[PDB]
Scaffold this active site. Structure first.
Site, mmCIF file in Angstrom:
data_model
loop_
_atom_site.group_PDB
_atom_site.id
_atom_site.type_symbol
_atom_site.label_atom_id
_atom_site.label_comp_id
_atom_site.label_asym_id
_atom_site.label_seq_id
_atom_site.Cartn_x
_atom_site.Cartn_y
_atom_site.Cartn_z
ATOM 1 N N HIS A 39 0.839 -1.202 0.000
ATOM 2 C CA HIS A 39 0.000 0.000 0.000
ATOM 3 C C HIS A 39 0.865 1.239 0.000
ATOM 4 O O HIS A 39 0.405 2.345 -0.212
ATOM 5 C CB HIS A 39 -0.758 0.089 1.322
ATOM 6 N N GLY A 174 0.354 7.558 10.002
ATOM 7 C CA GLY A 174 1.720 7.469 9.616
ATOM 8 C C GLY A 174 2.212 6.090 9.917
ATOM 9 O O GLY A 174 3.484 5.922 9.924
ATOM 10 N N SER A 176 1.611 2.834 8.420
ATOM 11 C CA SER A 176 1.645 1.815 7.400
ATOM 12 C C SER A 176 3.078 1.561 6.985
ATOM 13 O O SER A 176 3.820 2.524 6.667
ATOM 14 C CB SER A 176 0.828 2.220 6.172
ATOM 15 N N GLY A 177 3.344 0.242 6.803
ATOM 16 C CA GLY A 177 4.605 -0.384 6.313
ATOM 17 C C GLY A 177 5.614 -0.585 7.472
ATOM 18 O O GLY A 177 6.651 -1.216 7.229
HETATM 19 P P1 LIG Z 1 -1.144 3.865 5.822
HETATM 20 O O1 LIG Z 1 -2.237 3.776 6.658
HETATM 21 O O2 LIG Z 1 -1.922 4.185 4.482
HETATM 22 C C1 LIG Z 1 -1.104 4.385 3.312
HETATM 23 C C2 LIG Z 1 -1.478 3.447 2.177
HETATM 24 C C3 LIG Z 1 -1.234 5.809 2.835
HETATM 25 O O3 LIG Z 1 -0.715 5.153 6.612
HETATM 26 C C4 LIG Z 1 0.417 5.914 6.034
HETATM 27 C C5 LIG Z 1 -0.043 7.314 5.617
HETATM 28 C C6 LIG Z 1 1.567 6.134 7.031
#
Ligand SMILES: *P(=O)(OC(C)C)OC(C)C
Ligand SMILES: [Ca+2]
Length: 222
Positions: A39, A174, A176-177
């Site tokens: 994502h 902030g 994700s990943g």
């Molecule tokens: P993630 O929840 O979602 C991304 C695919 C944008 O959160 C990120 C913004 C740190």
């Protein structure tokens, strides 16, 4: 969202991914590779290692450009199944106390097991630190039931939940990943959910023990 201020450099394999600002977390797998969520994919990545306050240069960082991104080939962005990506670094990082890799699993983890979840901003701001300093939270792997019941029809084999069954604990953005690490192995990736301090909604994580052979192969192919 809960947890606290981690400590500058206490999670050496944490990475920040920056496209002119911090947009996702990740983990140093070896001096030339990072893993993060699919994502999170985007063109133009700079990988920042050794951060703490991503808004200040405090001395330890290494900024390295990404040179290649591999999203998992059966990644599905509607249901977020297989939500993982590899990032290859244009150069190698130098590893030292503050900047260090983290090891992949040999085995999957057992519900009940307690992990560390690392990352910037939920979103909040003032709990203690900064949307700005790395934050941390410890939380157990939940049962599949508990997880499945929390989100019926949505959880697959390549996911597990963790945290607290309510008012128990949630990150927010902030993050994700970024990593989920349990007994010294990377067992998770932060992937989605819909909780933080909402109710008993866990987060859901990409179940890394699933993807070990892909990662190793690929990485060695690239
Ligand atoms: P993630 O929840 O979602 C991304 C695919 C944008 O959160 C990120 C913004 C740190
Ligand atoms: Ca910094």
């Amino acid at each position: 969202v809960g947890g606290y201020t981690c400590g500058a450099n206490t999670v050496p394999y944490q990475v920040s991914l920056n496209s002119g600002y911090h947009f996702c977390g990740g983990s140093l797998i070896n001096s030339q590779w990072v893993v993060s969520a699919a994502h999170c994919y985007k063109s133009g990545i700079q990988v920042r290692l050794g951060e703490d306050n991503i808004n200040v240069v405090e001395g330890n960082e290494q900024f390295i450009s990404a040179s290649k991104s591999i999203v998992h080939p059966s990644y599905n962005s509607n249901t977020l199944n297989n939500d993982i990506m590899l990032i290859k670094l244009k150069s190698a990082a130098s590893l030292n106390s503050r900047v260090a890799s983290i090891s992949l699993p040999t085995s999957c983890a057992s519900a009940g097991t307690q992990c560390l979840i690392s990352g910037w901003g939920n979103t909040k701001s003032s709990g203690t630190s900064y949307p700005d300093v790395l934050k941390c939270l410890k939380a157990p792997i939940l049962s599949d039931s508990s997880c499945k019941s929390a989100y019926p029809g949505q959880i697959t084999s390549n996911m597990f939940c963790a945290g607290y069954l309510e008012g128990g604990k949630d990150s927010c953005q902030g993050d994700s990943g970024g990593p989920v690490v349990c007994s010294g192995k990377l067992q998770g990736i932060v992937s989605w959910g819909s909780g933080c301090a909402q109710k008993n909604k866990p987060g859901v994580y990409t179940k890394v023990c699933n993807y070990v052979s892909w990662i190793k192969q690929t990485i060695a192919s690239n």
